[PDB]
Write an enzyme that holds these catalytic residues in place. Structure first.
Site, PDB file in Angstrom:
ATOM      1  N   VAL A  13       0.852  -1.225   0.000  1.00  0.00           N
ATOM      2  CA  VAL A  13       0.000   0.000   0.000  1.00  0.00           C
ATOM      3  C   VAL A  13       0.872   1.255   0.000  1.00  0.00           C
ATOM      4  CG1 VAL A  13      -2.011  -1.123   0.992  1.00  0.00           C
ATOM      5  CG2 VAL A  13      -0.331  -0.117   2.536  1.00  0.00           C
ATOM      6  N   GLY A  14       2.184   1.081   0.034  1.00  0.00           N
ATOM      7  CA  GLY A  14       3.122   2.205   0.044  1.00  0.00           C
ATOM      8  C   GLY A  14       4.506   1.727  -0.303  1.00  0.00           C
ATOM      9  N   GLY A  16       8.488   3.783  -1.105  1.00  0.00           N
ATOM     10  CA  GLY A  16       9.270   5.028  -1.171  1.00  0.00           C
ATOM     11  C   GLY A  16      10.736   4.699  -1.140  1.00  0.00           C
ATOM     12  N   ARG A  17      11.579   5.717  -1.038  1.00  0.00           N
ATOM     13  CA  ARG A  17      13.049   5.559  -1.148  1.00  0.00           C
ATOM     14  C   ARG A  17      13.524   4.611  -0.037  1.00  0.00           C
ATOM     15  N   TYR A  18      12.842   4.626   1.118  1.00  0.00           N
ATOM     16  CA  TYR A  18      13.338   4.117   2.424  1.00  0.00           C
ATOM     17  C   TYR A  18      12.419   3.007   2.994  1.00  0.00           C
ATOM     18  CZ  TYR A  18      16.621   7.969   1.824  1.00  0.00           C
ATOM     19  OH  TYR A  18      17.578   8.811   1.336  1.00  0.00           O
ATOM     20  N   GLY A  19      11.507   2.516   2.165  1.00  0.00           N
ATOM     21  CA  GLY A  19      10.905   1.192   2.367  1.00  0.00           C
ATOM     22  C   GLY A  19       9.540   1.031   1.728  1.00  0.00           C
ATOM     23  N   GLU A  20       8.808   0.038   2.233  1.00  0.00           N
ATOM     24  CA  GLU A  20       7.459  -0.379   1.765  1.00  0.00           C
ATOM     25  C   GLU A  20       6.525  -0.485   2.962  1.00  0.00           C
ATOM     26  OE1 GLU A  20       8.052  -4.132  -0.294  1.00  0.00           O
ATOM     27  OE2 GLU A  20       9.200  -3.144  -1.864  1.00  0.00           O
ATOM     28  N   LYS A  34       5.455  -2.041   7.996  1.00  0.00           N
ATOM     29  CA  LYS A  34       6.487  -1.222   7.340  1.00  0.00           C
ATOM     30  C   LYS A  34       7.797  -1.999   7.317  1.00  0.00           C
ATOM     31  CE  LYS A  34       8.785   3.249   7.087  1.00  0.00           C
ATOM     32  NZ  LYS A  34       8.904   4.633   7.619  1.00  0.00           N
ATOM     33  N   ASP A 133       8.494  15.361  11.481  1.00  0.00           N
ATOM     34  CA  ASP A 133       8.175  15.186  10.035  1.00  0.00           C
ATOM     35  C   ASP A 133       6.657  15.168   9.801  1.00  0.00           C
ATOM     36  OD1 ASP A 133       8.724  15.013   7.291  1.00  0.00           O
ATOM     37  OD2 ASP A 133       9.150  12.822   7.401  1.00  0.00           O
TER      38      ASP A 133
END
Ligand SMILES: COc1cc(-c2cncc(-c3ccc(C4CCN(C)CC4)cc3)c2C)cc(OC)c1OC
Ligand SMILES: COc1cc(-c2cncc(-c3ccc(C4CCN(C)CC4)cc3)c2C)cc(OC)c1OC
Ligand SMILES: COc1cc(-c2cncc(-c3ccc(C4CCN(C)CC4)cc3)c2C)cc(OC)c1OC
EC number: 2.7.11.30
Length: 283
Positions: A13-14, A16-20, A34, A133
């Site tokens: 469902v996601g 990016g540069r720094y994981g799934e 994650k 963040d």
């Protein structure tokens, strides 16, 4: 005792540069998993260290289930397991939907509630926590119309933040790094930008703005640190408040609130507790 640890990873469902992030299944129940890239191992360690210090439990904080480290032949696998929110991130949601007054206020007051819980030191309890963040992708929408704050990988207790959401004192490197209150004030800036993103999607008098990220009209995609510094610090730009908001008492009040999160002087900005009180007196 049988300790059932198997999680079936069902769908991604996601990424990016720094994981799934995966929707997974444990004992018939959805969980979110994650999976960290080796590049962002320190985010797993920081969130794990925080949860080993204080087991945060709040309706507006993504619910912790587990931190898992598994030895592999030539690498370490790092998983963070949380509650699963099928409606996905606020960022996602605001592209698919407009809001009425009740839903707009319920979203932003729930975010303020989560953030005030992080910020407040409780004795007997929890340390004060700054997120560092906060943004619409790090907020999940729940079925009951409230949100919850996710990703404590950069949190501090008493990697850099997403550049688009950096406060002026982070961009001009004047932030008082030895002062915990500095980090709360950086979150309040970011909160004000999220408030703007949500308010744009609230209908009034048959009018709504399209979903846009903060500063969409003045910086590129993946803006540089310098791009942001020139907008926020040198020219002191702030997101636009459309005229149509001034016809609506809710959006008039929300525009005033977001202004009080965006002062150049960090110590002038409202606190999370003052933002909640203000939101409870709107409508
Ligand atoms: C190790 O790893 C994982 C474990 C589990 C999990 C599975 N069944 C049962 C448990 C359990 C909880 C608590 C106790 C207590 C009972 C009271 N007594 C005084 C002390 C002990 C025992 C057992 C757990 C923690 C799930 C996981 O994933 C969802 C795990 O992987 C992250
Ligand atoms: C990690 O997460 C999940 C864990 C479990 C789970 C599985 N076995 C046992 C437990 C447990 C039992 C008993 C105590 C004791 C502790 C002290 N005293 C004696 C009273 C209570 C603690 C823990 C739990 C909590 C279920 C879950 O979901 C249904 C979990 O969520 C995914
Ligand atoms: C931000 O951070 C974390 C978030 C999550 C998390 C928790 N619930 C649900 C989600 C999610 C589900 C579904 C969609 C979309 C995609 C699929 N389509 C059907 C529409 C909807 C988006 C998002 C996520 C991503 C977990 C995390 O850790 C385990 C996070 O990191 C701390």
């Amino acid at each position: 005792r049988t300790v059932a640890r198997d999680i079936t990873l069902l769908e991604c469902v996601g990424k990016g540069r720094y994981g799934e992030v995966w929707r997974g299944s444990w004992q018939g129940e959805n969980v979110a998993v994650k999976i960290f890239s080796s590049r962002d191992e320190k985010s797993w360690f920081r969130e794990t260290e925080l949860y080993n210090t204080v087991m945060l439990r709040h309706e507006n904080i993504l619910g912790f289930i587990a931190s898992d480290m598994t030895s592999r032949h030539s690498s370490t696998q790092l998983w963070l397991i949380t509650h699963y929110h099928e409606m996905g991130s606020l960022y996602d949601y605001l592209q698919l939907t407009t809001l009425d007054t009740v839903s707009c206020l319920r979203i932003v007051l729930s975010i303020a509630s989560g953030l005030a819980h992080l910020h407040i030191e409780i004795f007997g309890g929890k340390p004060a926590i700054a997120h560092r963040d906060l943004k619409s992708k790090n907020i999940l929408v729940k079925k009951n119309g409230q949100c919850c704050i996710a990703d404590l990988g950069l949190a501090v207790m008493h990697r850099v933040g997403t550049k688009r959401y950096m406060a002026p004192e982070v961009l001009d490197e004047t932030i008082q790094v030895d002062c915990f209150d500095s980090y709360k004030r950086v979150d309040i800036w970011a909160f004000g930008l999220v408030l703007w993103e949500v308010a744009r999607r609230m209908v009034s008098n048959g009018i709504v703005e399209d979903y846009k990220p903060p500063f969409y009209d003045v910086v590129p995609n993946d803006p540089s640190f310098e791009d942001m510094r020139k907008v926020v610090c040198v020219d002191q730009q702030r997101p636009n408040i459309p005229n149509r908001w001034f016809s609506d008492p809710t959006l008039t009040s929300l525009a005033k609130l977001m202004k009080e999160c965006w002062y150049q002087n960090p110590s002038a900005r409202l606190t999370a507790l003052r933002i909640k009180k203000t939101l409870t007196k709107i409508d």
